[PDB]
Amino acid sequence: SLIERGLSKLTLTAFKDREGKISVGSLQAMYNPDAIQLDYQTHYQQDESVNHTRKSSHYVSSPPAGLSLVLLFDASMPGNNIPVETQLTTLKALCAVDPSTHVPHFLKIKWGKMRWENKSYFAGRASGLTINYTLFDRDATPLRASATLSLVADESFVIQATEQQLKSPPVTTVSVTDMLTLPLIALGAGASLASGIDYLSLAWQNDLDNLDDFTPGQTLQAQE
Template sequence: MPPTSGASLVKARLVIMEPPPRVGAKPGGKLATVKFQFNPNALSLSKSTEWRRQPARMAGSASLPEFVGSGPRTLSVQVFLDATAKHDNSVEQRIESLMVACVPTKSSIAKKKPASPWVRFEWGTAKSVSFDGVLSSLSVDYSLFDVDGTPLRATCSLSIEEAGVDPPGQNPTSGTEEASRTHRVVVGDTLAQLAFREYGDPTAWRVIAEANDIDDPMVLVPGTELLVPLADGGGR
């Protein structure tokens, strides 16, 4: 569908924000807004689901899959940079502004809890590709240089992984929902892995260990159901 006649061009941008002050909280204040020099000509959005299937006793049949959960959305986008008309090192400056999203913020370092910023891709009224997440990868391909070696043209490939926030009403004082859930152990599971999946912090495995009276965190029996306290349920 062609653009509406007379409508102004809306530029895409990447909003860089302080990481949440605690598990389950929303991202903090805005650190920077990186405006795209050119709008992307393609966006790639993916989302996965995880299923568990018990081995079937009969070779000719298959067991019903059990839904475990859905994975985060992942947005992949390319940013094209061109400074051939200005020669003002804007390519390197813009790349440095994107690199900020890959390193811990000063405030998180000061609190002795290093964490990289959260980001959100925004482009007009688009909703499906606009969500809070973290920059999981950033690669740069330089394709043109000035006579003195200054980069004049580059393509940046970004991958943003959704970082969800638990919905409200999970605090036990609210009385609306349980403050924990269960997880059935499968081969390869570890408490650190489960803690990272639930809280974003693998060192929080002790919360799950205490809730299940686990003495040895290295021994998890497949098929065992673990009680997993929710982030807002006072477990941490």
């Protein structure tokens, strides 16, 4: 670390909406999980042709990413004063169907410096929750229980849109260096664009007088 050595705790937060503008509640795990699994799957369909002998497959809709955790709740050892039933009630309530939206809450998982594939949080919804009670008091108070939790990714639409146009900008800008030609410039400028660009279109957009009407150090722009 850099300053201190506090133990970061895993947190679960629930919202009614996808954009997370109406908080519902939160729960901090009393014991961090010792293993976290992330799963990515994507499906392809083979191309069948009657006149082509090529071998190729085209992309089909990929299932959403999955996340799995196991949390342990104890109320028997010294220092563990929060009842197990209270924590299990809160955990299930966050993963349940909202009485207003009639759909399950949207969840966020945060834990210290852990990054869940480029983001500090995992955005998704609960897809399964199994609870095993293994120890009880004489009045049937649960003393130990473990919850197996599994979510499926469900991200915000605003973040998806911004990241999409960041990596595929509507307009791109390039800088001209020595011994560059217009087809070479269009290749570099058109790499980030969705549909590329041709040398004639690039020349027209920049109001070039001819196909070589640029000097080193000059900047050029390319639109869709």
